[PDB]
From a paper:
HIV-1 reverse transcriptase (RT) has important biochemical functions for viral replication as RNA/DNA-dependent DNA polymerase and ribonuclease H (RNase H). HIV-1 reverse transcriptase is one of the most attractive targets for the treatment of AIDS. However, the rapid emergence of drug-resistant strains and unsatisfactory drug-like properties seriously limit the clinical application of HIV-1 non-nucleoside reverse transcriptase inhibitors (NNRTIs). The tolerant region I, which is formed from V106, F227, L234, P236 and Y318, is a modifiable chemical space that can accommodate various substituents.
Here we show that a series of piperazine sulfonyl-bearing diarylpyrimidine-based NNRTIs were designed to improve the potency against wild-type and NNRTI-resistant strains by enhancing backbone-binding interactions. We have determined the crystal structure of HIV-1 wild-type (WT) RT in complex with 18b1 at 2.5 Å resolution to gain a thorough understanding of the previously explained SAR. Notably, though, the cyano group of 18b1 displays hydrophobic contacts with the side chains of V106 and F227, and the sulfonyl group forms hydrogen bonds with the main chains of F227 and L234. Comparison of the protein-ligand contacts indicate that the main interactions are similar for 25a and 18b1. Significantly, there is an extended channel in the tolerant region I, consisting of F227 and P236, that leads to the solvent. A known effective medicinal chemistry strategy to overcome drug resistance is to establish interactions between the ligand and main chain atom(s) of the surrounding amino acid residues. Forming hydrogen bonds with the backbone atoms has advantage over interactions with the side chain of amino acids since the mutation will have minimal effect on the activity of these inhibitors. Among them, compound 18b1 demonstrates single-digit nanomolar potency against the wild-type and five mutant HIV-1 strains, which is significantly better than the approved drug etravirine. In order to confirm the drug target of the synthesized DAPY derivatives, representative compounds were selected to test their inhibitory activity against WT HIV-1 RT. These selected compounds exhibited inhibitory effect on HIV-1 RT with IC50 values between 0.19 to 0.056 μM, being evidently better than RVP (IC50 = 0.43 μM) and ETR (IC50 = 1.35 μM).
Author numbering:
A (entry chain A): -1 to 554
B (entry chain B): 4 to 213, 227 to 428
The structure:
Amino acid sequence: MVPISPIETVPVKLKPGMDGPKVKQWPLTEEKIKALVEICTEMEKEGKISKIGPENPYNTPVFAIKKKDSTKWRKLVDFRELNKRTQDFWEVQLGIPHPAGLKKKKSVTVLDVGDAYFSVPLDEDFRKYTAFTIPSINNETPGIRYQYNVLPQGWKGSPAIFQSSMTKILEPFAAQNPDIVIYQYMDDLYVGSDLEIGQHRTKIEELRQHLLRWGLTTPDKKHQKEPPFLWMGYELHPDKWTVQPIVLPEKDSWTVNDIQKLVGKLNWASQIYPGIKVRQLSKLLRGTKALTEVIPLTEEAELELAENREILKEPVHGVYYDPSKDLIAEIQKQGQGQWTYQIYQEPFKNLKTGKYARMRGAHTNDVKQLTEAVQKITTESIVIWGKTPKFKLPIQKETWETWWTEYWQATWIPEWEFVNTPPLVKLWYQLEKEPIVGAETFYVDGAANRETKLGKAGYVTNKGRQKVVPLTNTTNQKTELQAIYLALQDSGLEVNIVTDSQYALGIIQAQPDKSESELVNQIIEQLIKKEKVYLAWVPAHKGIGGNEQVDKLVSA
Amino acid sequence: PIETVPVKLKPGMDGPKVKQWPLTEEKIKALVEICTEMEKEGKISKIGPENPYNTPVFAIKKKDSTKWRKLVDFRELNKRTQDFWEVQLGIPHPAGLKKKKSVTVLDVGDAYFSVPLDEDFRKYTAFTIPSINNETPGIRYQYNVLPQGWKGSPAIFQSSMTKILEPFKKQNPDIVIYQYMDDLYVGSDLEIGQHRTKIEELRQHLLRWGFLWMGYELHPDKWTVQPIVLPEKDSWTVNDIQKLVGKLNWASQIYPGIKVRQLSKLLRGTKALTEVIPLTEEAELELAENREILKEPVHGVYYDPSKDLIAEIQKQGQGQWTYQIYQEPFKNLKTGKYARMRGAHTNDVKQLTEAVQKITTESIVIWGKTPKFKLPIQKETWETWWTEYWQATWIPEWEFVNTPPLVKLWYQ
Ligand SMILES: Cc1cc(/C=C/C#N)cc(C)c1Oc1ccnc(Nc2ccc(N3CCN(S(C)(=O)=O)CC3)c(C#N)c2)n1
């Protein structure tokens, strides 16, 4: 007999203060007990479990289920209670690779390590918490008591300890064979390389040799799957990759569950299918928790869906990552706060695509939205490829320079060059830094009554021009915006505006080009038409003339 | 130092469980090399899945150094590590460190790697070298000695550090030496020629007791509350007087007796913004009395070591940045301004990142602790890029300002 190395045991503890599980064993049918006893007697012969005495005070229920064509009962141990009491582990399998970050491999083998899983022993001081009882026939003898010696299926710490134990075993083989790559997924093991079909087969035998040192027999996976690998919702091909088939259903009655399963398909497809839009379909789910509510599609939601069927009419594919070539990312504005981007290395051979949606807020502008999308692509690219891509953005170099130099916040976008793909991101207005000579000066103010909601907004100017407008169903902040709107409405192409509204200044200094406030949008449409707008602020109720005259005119 | 100092978290707090943010390839490769040697020297060791804790890690380059350095964002562990009184009820911060002409900052963090850590505490210093595209499981480590950037590292080492410095302090009683985390602040009151000699004579003395060869020179001579200044003009426009009254109205929150009645009396009417208004006798007087008030410091300002230090920053354009350090609004304990940030005339974030480091260094020298920053930047932008320009072994706290402050004009 050939000595094998013992797999190093991982010390496991329960959560602090908690004991082990003491769940009662359900009554089972006689025909069920006979099937468990047969299964466990085989498992006991294989060393997986071991009989124990009645001194062990823990128990975990066991169950018997079957398949309809498989003519056998199956053995299920319900570790729901022991999992609640088991410590937390470093779950090292949460994040999966993205296909756009993989390198093409000429040859790839699949090895089954299902029998390898049972070779992983369990911490001896923890095995007593995995006790379970097979009820006896007619409850006339003590039930057969067992405990696990290996990682039990369904236990909390089994996947992390199995993946970690296999990683430690493979580490010498991988580190010293740098011309191959190894990846583990469930009871499978995937090894890929660019060696010839001969040298590739030798390394697999060398790797089979290396796994026998701990005594792990690994044959090939049953029914060797032909291209593509159906893995985690993807189609992995020898040279290309794409998502599993995105078929959008036809329907005349869409519930909010149908729209939910829809958006999931577009969101998943949007990583390779360029131009996918999901908002007008997401606006039909703004606030609901019951899933049958048939919500009629707006004319914009249909137009968005039909635009997606056109994008999903023909299958598109992503290429694998060539580290020797540059990484490029290109963004396009799509309207209503939506943005699409493509990431590639050779023109028209996308690695992946994606989309970004504008954040929820009352005011915004295109440059902010473009900046946010760039950061998201930056973070995604560093995850997938470990580097920031070169950006091609639809904004003039002069526009961006004027923006960030005058913006009150600090902002930065990495290396980027302008691409002339309309619609171009532009600055729709720019306030003056100094008062304008010869331009009429509009002193504006508004005021409302908190109780009756009645208010007034208006202005007085240095040329004697005046206006006061009465308002109903309004607030102090709304009349302050209305007053500025009136001055913009009634002035020439160049105008100085004096206000005391810290609220209005805070909005305009944020430089929005679109707003959820219909009144702010109207002010923006007026600023766009102007030539020079100098917005000046003064404190209220301090005797500033012009401000004092119009404050009394609008306050009752 | 065979004996380990018993360390424990605070009651009812688990160890840190902070996600590791993505790293570039060159930083992953750098961290792999550094950690491979550190593991060979026994400073760190591989860990298994039974350790659920994690503390983020990345790689920087210290001020004008081409070698990659490992930085561990121990911020969460430091708040969860129990409040330390390792030798005494606390260290009295040297108020004379901020009064010296020159202060040199030495990175003495490599001396921490000589004393082991409590075995029961090593699991809380777990960190992960991430992999590109999750293609391999992350390399998991935990520390065997005191790690750089941990609150307990200077505390546990204070007993050992004070004995290394005792003969150098015995011969130079006028030299102030202060320690904050991985840094030694050594200041004196003398000409730089003998200062670098004393500094060189200090690190050679540290070398014989068991370094890095890098320094950071400061001059806390010019650290105070910068005064509020009003313009001096011969012809005032309506716009000039409006900004003046607005600035004086803002200062009136801080200072008493600030009057604006006679200056507002100048704006009697609805005049053009560019029209020049002559100052009356009662207006120039009111402006003069306001100048006298603003010459004097703020009433009732004091540092409270129980409260947080708050540091606000304003972007002023052309590489200029203003800031204020306070604990209560309108009670500024320090104000200042920066200009022409080195190597970033075209990068706003790099300038802001360098400003945060400078303000933090100033706060360490004055009060012995770092402030909480209100940063004029969107969360996602700062979050993505600040590590690319960070060069200090410590990391302060920060929040994000999303509404443009009107007081930016008043610090212009
Ligand atoms: C080797 C490997 C395997 C997996 C398996 C997951 C599953 N089911 C996952 C990772 C992360 C993985 O690791 C890496 C790391 C870096 N680079 C790549 N690149 C790459 C390049 C080509 C591939 N193949 C596509 C499909 N096949 S085939 C017979 O035609 O279906 C042809 C070859 C595969 C695969 N496989 C992988 N893989």
